[PDB]
Design a binder for these strands. Structure first.
Ligand code: K
Ligand code: K
Ligand code: K
Ligand code: K
Ligand code: K
Ligand code: K
Ligand code: K
Ligand code: K
Ligand code: K
Ligand code: K
Ligand code: K
Ligand code: K
Ligand code: K
Ligand code: K
Ligand code: K
Ligand code: K
Ligand code: K
Ligand code: K
Ligand code: K
Ligand code: K
Ligand code: K
Ligand code: K
Ligand code: K
Ligand code: K
Ligand code: K
Ligand code: K
Ligand code: K
Ligand code: K
Ligand code: K
Ligand code: K
Ligand code: K
Ligand code: K
Ligand code: K
Ligand code: K
Ligand code: K
Ligand code: K
Ligand code: K
Ligand code: K
Ligand code: K
Ligand code: K
Ligand code: K
Ligand code: MG
Ligand code: MG
Ligand code: MG
Ligand code: MG
Ligand code: MG
Lengths: 181, 162, 79, 129, 82, 152
RNA sequence: GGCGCUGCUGCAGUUGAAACGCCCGUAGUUGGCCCCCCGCCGCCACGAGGAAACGGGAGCGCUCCAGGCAGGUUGGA
């Protein structure tokens, strides 16, 4: 890391995101409808009592492969052990793209992938599709029709082996087409 | 120096000096051979101003050694949809070769409207049709239009009359 | 006798349908008429089917007819 | 509706020559039709043509010299590997010595002899002989 | 010329005639085909012996009556008519 | 035309001039025919009739040749384009008329047949406009509600 | 296999067997012409990587042969 930190003079003020995260943590403590207190495993919970600010209050990482961390994950207040940026999982294996078929589950979506199958006797093709279940971190929000890029992780449920890592929005009320990519 | 945009690239000084319309100025005069040698460029958002009085303007120039055409300065863009990072920017349709080369042949003879084009496949050539009534006042200017069009587009061109 | 399709005779080309000509073109045209009581002159479409008035008159001076239109008591030209 | 402009052009040309006409008009025009007529011309099967502009889909006027036994298109445009060309040659062509199958490849439009001269494949669009 | 051997010799038995109008080959047993010849005067309104022009027409052009105009057009190209 | 919902096969149409230029007698500038277009649109004239009036009174063959744009685009540029395009509006009007005729005459099956044809055309065109972003994504033709939307 | 009597190449549907009584219409299939010199598919070519036997195929007289991998510096490409 050859270069070192150019000089803005509003940095320490702009770290008011510390009180932001702190009061979000203290709001989670008051929602007595919950049964478990949710917290990241990478973070002490004694760093919140301190005032010198010297220690970070939220954990995040980079996933590699030229995919950059969204700022909504860096400055969010949610808890997700299955989020690839702020949870306890990793991305490795195949990386694919598809379209959102359904977003009706809890932090889970269905993805529709399209492809062609050649039949040699008839010298022609047929159009085919498959459905893939994927995990949706709160740092993204999607609707049906949007393009997504998903990447492989370890097994996460009976049907899920992938995680949403990029979103390309698609306007509502547009003609739905084959769109293989 | 107030009649041209470029400065200091100076083949014909005298055109700017003679042209001194008080609000108008030109750029980038050119010389094309082939007899009586020959093209004057103008900034695009003044063509409609220049073409207003252009029949009686070209006379007051044809500097008897040369012949003068008034054309607009037009940009041709290479790619449609340049993909710069995360987005694609769309090439304006007026900036293609097919549009600009069609505008040049219309501005080459502006007071007169061509009434037909054909492409002959004999090296392909272009045949341009004009109304017969105005056969005079173009008859002596046709070889200049053909040579200049080949110089600016490299298309063979012949002229016939309605 | 030897006709060339690339340079048809205009006379026998005008008698064909406007669309199956070599280069499609309109059949209509404009023309000048003179008001029967006013010195001036107005330019009128040859296939009009909408009101056309005098500069002075309030009586409509055209009769729509399903083809070329006729006129009431006026004398015409071609430009 | 109208789908294959090249098919209609070639049917019109074959009809006109079978009658014994000197010229024929085909409309509309297109880039593909001009490429097909250019190849037919360069092999010597037709004379001059002319594309006439109408600020629409243009017309073409074709001059005929009585050398065209048949011309057609292959729909759909099946793709052909380099080694299947000959299994197509003995299918469409009257012999192995004259006639032409036209392919589109990433090196342009070309006949089959040049396609095996550059040892590549492509997609078939038509044939004449 | 006709078909050639691999060395350069024509291995063709005979060459059919071609139509002067439609360039089609005549072929044997096409008994509607006609060859005919025109005088080519050239000499003060009187013909010259054994100096003619000669055309041929296949049966397809005759079966529809196309020859009356095509023969005329062919003649106007050889300086025998106008 | 006359061929989507019948066995017509008619070809009657207009063919515009090859040359794209003002008229020899054209005095008008774009800024002064835009004036007449906007005065006619404010008065309540539909865009297909504005072209008729400019053709028949002002001796202008094509508005595009004298301005460089088209009539509906100029209306849109001065904020005077309609909420609903003219052709869809006319089809809805004809549907309302046929339904109101059928309210007194329940034995007219020919009119019911033509009502079906008109409404099928309406749905197809509405889908076109919707996916093209010329109409709200929630636009829907409703037979029962169509009479009072014509006022707005 | 004969069999183009299963037809992608490549059948038949007026009368031999066979065009729904007709109109609308979703899924599906198909869709004129135009900008070239960007991106993403398909497609074509060439590579990398993974099994032999079988199947092709270079060389070799189990006396020939079906074989086999021999052999007189070699070889199983
Ligand atoms: K988290
Ligand atoms: K695919
Ligand atoms: K497959
Ligand atoms: K399919
Ligand atoms: K689970
Ligand atoms: K599960
Ligand atoms: K599809
Ligand atoms: K006709
Ligand atoms: K007509
Ligand atoms: K008429
Ligand atoms: K129909
Ligand atoms: K009809
Ligand atoms: K018809
Ligand atoms: K009904
Ligand atoms: K109905
Ligand atoms: K419908
Ligand atoms: K309906
Ligand atoms: K539709
Ligand atoms: K519909
Ligand atoms: K309305
Ligand atoms: K069989
Ligand atoms: K078989
Ligand atoms: K067989
Ligand atoms: K059949
Ligand atoms: K039966
Ligand atoms: K039966
Ligand atoms: K029967
Ligand atoms: K049927
Ligand atoms: K059926
Ligand atoms: K039906
Ligand atoms: K239907
Ligand atoms: K339909
Ligand atoms: K459908
Ligand atoms: K579909
Ligand atoms: K199908
Ligand atoms: K499809
Ligand atoms: K279709
Ligand atoms: K491929
Ligand atoms: K290729
Ligand atoms: K092995
Ligand atoms: K060795
Ligand atoms: Mg007509
Ligand atoms: Mg239909
Ligand atoms: Mg029709
Ligand atoms: Mg008509
Ligand atoms: Mg069989």
């Amino acid at each position: 890391r050859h270069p070192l930190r150019p000089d803005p003079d509003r940095e320490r003020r702009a770290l008011e995101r510390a009180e932001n995260l702190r009061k979000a943590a203290y709001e989670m403590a008051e929602n007595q409808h919950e049964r478990a207190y949710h917290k990241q495993s990478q973070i002490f919970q004694g760093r919140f009592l301190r005032k010198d600010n010297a220690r970070c209050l939220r954990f995040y990482k980079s996933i590699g492969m030229g995919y950059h961390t969204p700022i909504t994950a860096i400055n969010g207040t949610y808890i997700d052990k299955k989020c690839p940026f702020t949870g306890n999982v990793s991305i490795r294996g195949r990386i694919l793209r598809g379209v959102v078929h359904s977003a009706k589950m809890q932090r889970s979506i269905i993805v529709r992938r399209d492809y062609l199958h050649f039949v040699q006797k008839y010298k022609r093709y047929e159009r085919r599709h498959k459905h893939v279940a994927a995990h949706l971190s709160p740092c993204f929000r999607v609707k049906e029709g949007d393009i997504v890029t998903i990447g492989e992780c370890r097994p996460l449920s009976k049907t899920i082996r992938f995680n949403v890592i990029k979103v390309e929005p698609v306007s509502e009320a547009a003609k739905k087409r084959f769109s293989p990519f | 120096r107030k009649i041209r945009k470029p400065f200091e690239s100076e083949l014909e000084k005298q055109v700017a000096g003679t042209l001194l319309l008080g609000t108008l100025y030109i750029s980038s005069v050119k010389e094309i051979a082939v007899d009586k040698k020959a093209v004057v460029y103008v900034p695009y958002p003044m063509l409609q101003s220049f073409q207003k009085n252009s029949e009686a303007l070209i006379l007051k120039l044809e500097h008897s050694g040369h012949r003068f055409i008034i054309v607009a300065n037009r940009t041709i863009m290479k790619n449609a949809y340049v993909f710069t990072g995360k987005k694609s920017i769309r090439r304006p349709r007026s900036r293609t070769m097919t549009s600009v080369y069609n505008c040049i042949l219309d501005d080459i003879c502006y007071p007169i409207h061509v009434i037909g084009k054909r492409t002959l496949y004999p090296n392909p050539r272009l045949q341009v049709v004009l109304p017969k009534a105005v056969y005079n006042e173009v008859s002596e200017r046709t070889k200049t239009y053909s040579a200049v069009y080949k110089a600016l587009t490299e298309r063979d061109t012949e002229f016939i009359f309605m | 006798m030897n006709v060339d399709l690339l340079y048809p005779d205009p006379v026998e080309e005008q008698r064909k349908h406007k669309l199956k000509r070599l280069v499609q073109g309109p059949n209509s045209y404009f023309l000048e008429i003179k008001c029967a009581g006013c010195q001036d002159i107005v330019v009128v479409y040859s296939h009009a089917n909408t009101p056309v008035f005098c500069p002075g008159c309030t009586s409509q001076i055209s009769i729509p007819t399903g083809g070329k239109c006729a006129f009431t008591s006026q004398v015409e030209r071609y430009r | 509706v109208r789908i294959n402009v090249l098919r209609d052009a070639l049917k019109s040309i074959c009809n006109a020559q079978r009658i014994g006409k000197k010229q024929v008009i085909v409309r509309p025009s297109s880039k593909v039709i001009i490429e097909f007529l250019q190849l037919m011309q360069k092999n010597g099967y037709i004379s001059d043509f002319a594309v006439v502009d109408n600020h629409r889909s243009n017309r073409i006027v074709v001059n005929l010299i009585g050398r065209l036994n048949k011309a057609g298109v292959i729909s759909p445009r099946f793709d052909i590997p380099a080694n299947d060309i000959e299994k197509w040659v003995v299918n469409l062509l009257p012999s192995r010595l004259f006639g032409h199958i036209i392919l589109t490849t990433s090196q342009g439009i070309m006949d089959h002899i040049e396609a095996q001269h550059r040892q590549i494949g492509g997609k078939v669009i038509g044939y004449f002989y | 010329i006709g078909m050639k051997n691999s060395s350069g010799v024509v291995v063709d038995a005979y060459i059919p005639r071609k139509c002067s109008a439609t360039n089609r080959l005549i072929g044997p047993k096409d008994h509607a085909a006609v060859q005919l010849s025109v005088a080519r005067v050239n000499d003060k309104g009187k013909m010259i012996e054994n100096n003619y022009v000669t055309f041929a027409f296949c049966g397809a052009i005759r079966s529809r009556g196309g020859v009356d105009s095509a023969f005329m057009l062919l003649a106007q190209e050889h300086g025998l008519m106008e | 035309m006359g061929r989507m919902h019948s066995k017509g096969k008619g070809i009657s149409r207009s063919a515009i001039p090859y040359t794209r230029a003002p008229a020899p007698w054209n005095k008008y500038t774009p800024e002064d025919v835009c004036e007449q277009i906007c005065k006619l649109a404010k008065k309540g004239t539909p865009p297909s009739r504005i072209g008729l009036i400019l053709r028949d009174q002002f001796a202008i063959g094509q508005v595009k040749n004298v301005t460089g744009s088209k009539i509906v685009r100029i209306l849109k540029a001065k904020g005077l384009a309609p909420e609903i395009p003219e052709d869809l509006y006319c089809m809805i009007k004809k549907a309302v008329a046929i339904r109101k005729h059928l309210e007194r005459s329940r034995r007219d099956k020919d009119s019911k047949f033509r009502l079906i044809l008109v409404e099928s055309r309406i749905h197809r065109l509405a889908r076109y406009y919707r996916q093209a972003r010329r109409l709200p994504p929630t636009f829907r033709y409703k037979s029962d509600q169509a009479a009072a939307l014509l006022a707005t």
